[PDB]
């Protein structure tokens, strides 16, 4: 159960965002409306929301999921693999002394990791492996879950260039696999889910206090978890998928 959840807005240097697509630039003002929805989403998920302004400096600073991972026992401050997001993690370190006093911890250079790399299974983390998040990273990473109690082992990584973009814990054993994913060993004891090629985005979605908030336009995955008995939320993202961002990407929850 998660009790809060800490959002960025959108900045305009948003349109020139890490993309690795052809999906077009995204558009500032239908992003900065998206963004509204997602929010109010949120609102009506027992939670209190910690919205921080948007910084110029950092096009991708709305994606606060990889800046930090917020654990029951600590948060760590990550180190970005992409250079343009690094200071991202000092912007909001004050935010999350706030939430974690005394209980901080970051990872140091040569390694790197972006929380977007790891799905929080109970009090196992799954780290994969990615450009992003390299072999030191995550091995400081273990090191500091395994201080506070806490494990994470990784996986390997094949097509997907970061770990939730073809999975989703929503809690209750069910996972939503795509791609891949779907028949990697690791996650056999799960109630895999099956996220169908065209619909292989909405691969990325969270589960927030029973209530689980997906992508708008993938009816197929979509019912499947309604099928669940989940209360299902959608919101287009669209214009963060233009950046490879997506529901998961947008907010830290704990």
């Not at 077009?24 to 009506?44: C, F, M, S, V």
């Not at 929503?170 to 939503?176: A, D, Q």
Request: net charge negative; hydrophobic share 35%.
């Amino acid at each position: 159960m998660f009790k809060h959840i800490i959002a960025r807005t959108p900045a305009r240097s948003l349109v020139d965002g890490l993309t690795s697509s052809h999906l077009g630039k995204p558009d500032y003002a239908k992003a900065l409306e998206q963004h509204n929805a997602y929010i109010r989403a949120l609102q009506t998920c027992d939670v209190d929301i910690t919205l921080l302004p948007p910084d110029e400096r950092f096009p991708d600073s709305v994606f606060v999921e990889d800046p930090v991972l917020c654990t029951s026992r600590c948060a760590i401050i990550t180190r970005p693999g992409a250079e343009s997001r690094r200071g991202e993690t000092e912007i909001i370190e004050e935010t999350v002394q706030r939430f974690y006093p005394g209980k901080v911890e970051r990872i140091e250079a040569p390694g790197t990791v972006e929380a977007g790399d790891i799905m929080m299974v109970g009090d196992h983390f799954y780290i994969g492996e990615s450009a992003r998040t390299n072999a030191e990273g995550a091995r400081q990473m273990i090191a500091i879950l395994e201080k506070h109690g806490l494990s994470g082992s990784v996986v390997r990584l094949e097509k997907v260039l970061g770990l939730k973009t073809g999975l989703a814990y929503l809690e209750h054993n069910n996972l939503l696999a795509a791609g891949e994913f779907v028949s990697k060993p690791e996650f056999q004891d799960f109630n895999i889910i099956e996220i169908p090629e065209e619909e292989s985005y909405a691969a990325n979605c969270i589960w927030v206090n029973e209530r689980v908030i997906m992508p708008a336009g993938y009816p197929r995955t979509r019912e499947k978890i309604a099928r669940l008995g989940y209360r299902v939320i959608e919101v287009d993202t669209s214009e963060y998928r233009k950046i490879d961002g997506g529901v998961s990407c947008m907010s830290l929850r704990f």
